[PDB]
Design a protein around this ligand. Structure first.
Ligand SMILES: Nc1ncnc2c1ncn2[C@@H]1O[C@H](COP(=O)(O)OP(=O)(O)O)[C@@H](O)[C@H]1O
Ligand SMILES: Nc1ncnc2c1ncn2[C@@H]1O[C@H](COP(=O)(O)OP(=O)(O)O)[C@@H](O)[C@H]1O
Ligand SMILES: Nc1ncnc2c1ncn2[C@@H]1O[C@H](COP(=O)(O)O)[C@@H](O)[C@H]1O
Lengths: 69, 104, 304
């Protein structure tokens, strides 16, 4: 009864997937499904600004949280 | 406010980025599942409210040198009560960043 | 209190119906520095922010311009006596200071509650910001205001099943305030104006000349203009000088007369997108104020 061999495909995850399903890195503030994703201002004066857009029914709110570090 | 960035960017090794967020998750007592080497599902029990919150982490390559960690909230399924799914999502993210990450 | 068309309409519409398709919400963690929080209201073009207590994991209140006014008045006074805490106050610590023994919880409303309940709540709590909070997720969806409610009403009620009271004047309906009107002069320094805001709990002061005729108006919205500068010291300047830094070219003050119908007043207010009209006589001498709260208090009790 022969030994068996294993074929391992590693290079489907050699490196992370490139970004664009047209999700935008930068927003300089209606626009498609960036919904539920975290956005952030560059940290200034020891405060985090976290952002995201969520859906309630047909309504969309972009919430900003100002949070000390 | 002017420029909004999706998640956070890093020029650390991808494998380091992922290992560090994984140690961060375990430290914080969140539970996780590795869908992909670059894709995590994470769940936290709110120590105050006893509600659960879920989110996704996904790493993307943006340059030959640069990666972008993306956080995405996952949906469930008179004076207020404790809890806000959105704010709580912000705090998970923040905690994860604080505990795996240093401003370089 | 009766069977008006406005009353039926408010009782049949949910608060959800008023939320715009797309909006922004600014939330402050209560450990945030007050100075930073107020710079954030301005930066974002926003007037109110729900407050989140991380230790309690809930919204516990609002931060508005009125709070900014209170704080700035106290800072001004404390400075003259070499006390400089406040600017380094975090929201939390300002709150335990100002709310002393008073419990004053956050008042809010469900997206599924009636517009009637919203207007009643705003009136009864004597409040201008009513966050709409989803009870399933606990998210604040929207901050509901008098201005928004009146606009919705004007737009979505057919004109011509018109109640008789819509053709009646301010004079006969007795909507508005016609005594003890808080006003300032051209020359009145900003800090004195602040004191007047604090004492009279009033959102705007008509600016008058020697003959008591209105020439301008000094609002609470006009006071976060101070929060864009690193220096607050410019509190000693006259009201007229403070108003030079206003957003756009200023058409004049929005006025009305005692004898105008409610319909005319509602329309002017809705169109102009202002919180109140200054009530004036034949000679532009100010006789009173008609506010959005006055109108909405009338509409919810059937023209009273
Ligand atoms: N929904 C609310 N629940 C509890 N307190 C509130 C609410 N809205 C405002 N307040 C508080 O009541 C006071 C009056 O504010 P208000 O007149 O509503 O706002 P503005 O200052 O924008 O006119 C402030 O101290 C404010 O923080
Ligand atoms: N009756 C009025 N006539 C002319 N300008 C006004 C009048 N009321 C308010 N304004 C101005 O319009 C702007 C709107 O502010 P205001 O209506 O007080 O609060 P809100 O932010 O709720 O609209 C302010 O800059 C104020 O100076
Ligand atoms: N400058 C003012 N002086 C006296 N009363 C006012 C003034 N402005 C508004 N009011 C009244 O105070 C109540 C609250 O108005 P407002 O603060 O504009 O919502 C209403 O009944 C107004 O008619």
């Amino acid at each position: 009864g022969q030994e068996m061999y294993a074929f391992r495909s590693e290079e489907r995850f050699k490196s992370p997937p490139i970004l664009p399903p047209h999700l935008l890195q930068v927003i300089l503030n209606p626009n498609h499904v960036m919904l539920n994703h975290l956005y952030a201002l560059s940290i200034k004066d020891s405060v985090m600004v976290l952002s995201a857009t969520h859906r309630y029914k047909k309504k969309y709110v972009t919430t900003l949280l100002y949070k000390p570090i | 406010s002017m420029a909004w960035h999706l998640g956070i960017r890093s020029q650390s090794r991808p494998n380091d980025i992922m290992a560090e967020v994984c140690r961060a998750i375990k430290q914080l007592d969140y539970e996780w599942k590795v869908v992909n080497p670059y894709y995590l599902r994470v769940r936290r029990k709110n120590p105050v409210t006893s509600t659960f919150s879920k989110m996704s982490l996904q790493l993307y390559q943006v340059d030959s040198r640069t990666y972008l960690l993306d956080f995405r909230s996952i949906d469930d399924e008179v004076a207020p009560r404790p809890g806000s799914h959105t704010i709580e999502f912000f705090e998970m993210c923040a905690n994860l960043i604080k505990n795996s990450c240093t401003v370089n | 209190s009766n069977s008006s068309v406005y009353t039926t309409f408010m009782k049949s519409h949910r608060c959800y119906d008023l939320i715009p398709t797309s909006s922004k919400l600014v939330v402050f963690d209560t450990s945030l520095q007050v100075k930073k929080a107020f710079f954030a209201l301005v930066t974002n073009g926003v007037r109110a922010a729900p407050l989140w207590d991380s230790k309690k994991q809930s919204f516990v209140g609002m931060l508005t311009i009125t709070d900014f006014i209170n704080i700035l008045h106290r800072y001004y006074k404390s400075a003259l006596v070499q006390i400089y805490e406040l600017e380094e106050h975090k929201i939390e610590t300002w709150r335990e200071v100002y709310l002393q023994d008073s419990f004053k919880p956050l008042v809010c409303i469900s997206p599924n509650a009636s517009l009637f309940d919203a207007v009643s709540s705003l009136i009864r709590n004597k409040i201008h910001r009513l966050p709409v909070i989803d009870p399933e997720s606990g998210n604040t969806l929207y901050i509901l205001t008098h201005k928004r409610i009146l606009k919705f009403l004007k737009l979505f009620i057919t004109e011509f099943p018109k109640p008789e009271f819509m053709s009646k004047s301010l004079e006969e309906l007795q909507i508005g305030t016609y005594a003890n009107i808080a006003m300032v002069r051209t020359t009145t320094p900003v800090y004195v104006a602040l004191g007047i805001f604090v004492q009279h709990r009033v959102s705007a002061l008509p600016v008058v000349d020697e003959k008591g005729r209105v020439v301008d108006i000094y609002s609470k919205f006009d006071v976060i203009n101070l929060a864009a500068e690193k220096t607050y010291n410019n509190l000693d300047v006259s009201v007229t000088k403070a108003l030079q830094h206003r957003s756009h070219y200023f058409e004049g003050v929005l006025k009305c007369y005692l004898h105008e119908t409610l319909e005319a007043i509602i329309n002017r207010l809705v169109e102009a997108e202002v919180h109140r009209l200054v009530v004036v006589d034949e000679h532009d001498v100010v006789k009173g104020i008609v506010s959005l709260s006055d109108i909405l208090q009338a509409l919810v009790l059937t023209g009273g």
